[PDB]
Ligand binder design. Structure first.
Ligand SMILES: *[C@@H]1O[C@H](CO)[C@@H](O[C@@H]2O[C@H](CO)[C@@H](O)[C@H](O)[C@H]2NC(C)=O)[C@H](O)[C@H]1NC(C)=O
Ligand SMILES: CCCCCCCCCC[C@@H](O)[C@@H](CCCCCC)C(=O)O
Length: 246
């Protein structure tokens, strides 16, 4: 299990949490020095439990699939909550079994469905450590519309930060003040599967992408990523989705 406490949190302690999160994900192989997530894991070992504490010390436990960093559901007091998707239902067979009741959320976990439920794209949802504190508090008491927005915050400040050093740094900059994610942040989130695939395809292609990946940079300009010498590959991406899962 990994843990993060919003009470007394700073860029340093958040950085430690993201390191812990990355380190809790198993790999037997690195591709271009980037850990390669496993094709599959059987049993309860497939799921990592993140213990998150809001400023007041109230807690949720979040279940994360270690093969893809997808949040499947969470526990809030004695109630478990899972996304409306087969992978999450499967997760409910292994985690939070001692919960008194189980609620299935009226949406899947994908960005498009969550944005519809929340009533706004994540371009317009501020993120940061204060937003994460809010998200935790929101998830403690069931409200499906509010929960959609909270989950959009949660996914980006945990899973996406684990996947990209740039996103981790973005959240560290937002330690005491929320701000909507940069277009670069959104771009990286959307391209994680694509980048993971192409980095793996580069293995037998002299470090060259079979298909170029289009990203928006920090300055806000659209750039093409064609090979492994790109800063996105050498410095940014921290975890690779296995091509068996793409
Ligand atoms: C591999 O990727 C790099 C980009 O990371 C490519 O180089 C850039 O491409 C041209 C010059 O060739 C310039 O417009 C850019 O300024 C370069 N960027 C950087 C950061 O140097 C390179 O062309 C690619 N190589 C192959 C074989 O595809
Ligand atoms: C893709 C259609 C159904 C969703 C399948 C699993 C995705 C939900 C699992 C958690 C998810 O929110 C991920 C990030 C979202 C990626 C989906 C956007 C298209 C996560 O928890 O980081």
């Amino acid at each position: 299990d990994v843990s993060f406490r919003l009470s007394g949190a700073d860029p340093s302690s958040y950085g430690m949490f993201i390191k812990d999160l990355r380190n809790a994900l198993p790999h037997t192989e690195k591709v271009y020095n980037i850990p390669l997530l496993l094709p599959s894991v059987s049993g309860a070992g497939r799921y990592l439990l993140m213990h998150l504490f809001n400023y007041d010390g109230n807690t949720i436990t979040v279940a994360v699939d270690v093969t893809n960093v997808y949040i499947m559901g969470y526990l809030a007091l004695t109630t478990s909550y899972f996304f409306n998707e087969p992978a999450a239902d499967l997760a409910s067979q292994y985690v939070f079994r001692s919960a008194r009741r189980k609620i299935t959320l009226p949406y899947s976990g994908n960005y498009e469905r969550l944005q519809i439920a929340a009533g706004k794209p994540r371009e317009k949802i501020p993120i940061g450590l204060p937003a994460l504190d809010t998200a935790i508090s929101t998830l403690l008491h069931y409200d499906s519309t509010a929960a959609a927005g909270a989950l959009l915050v949660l996914i980006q400040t945990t899973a996406e930060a684990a996947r990209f050093k740039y996103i981790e740094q973005q959240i560290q900059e937002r330690a005491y003040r929320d701000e909507v994610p940069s277009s670069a942040t959104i771009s990286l989130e959307n391209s994680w599967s694509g980048l993971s695939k192409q980095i793996q395809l580069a293995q037998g292609n002299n470090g060259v992408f079979r298909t170029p990946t289009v990203l928006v940079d920090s300055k806000g300009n659209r750039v093409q990523i064609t090979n492994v010498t790109s800063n996105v590959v050498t410095s940014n991406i921290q975890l690779l989705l296995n091509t068996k899962n793409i």
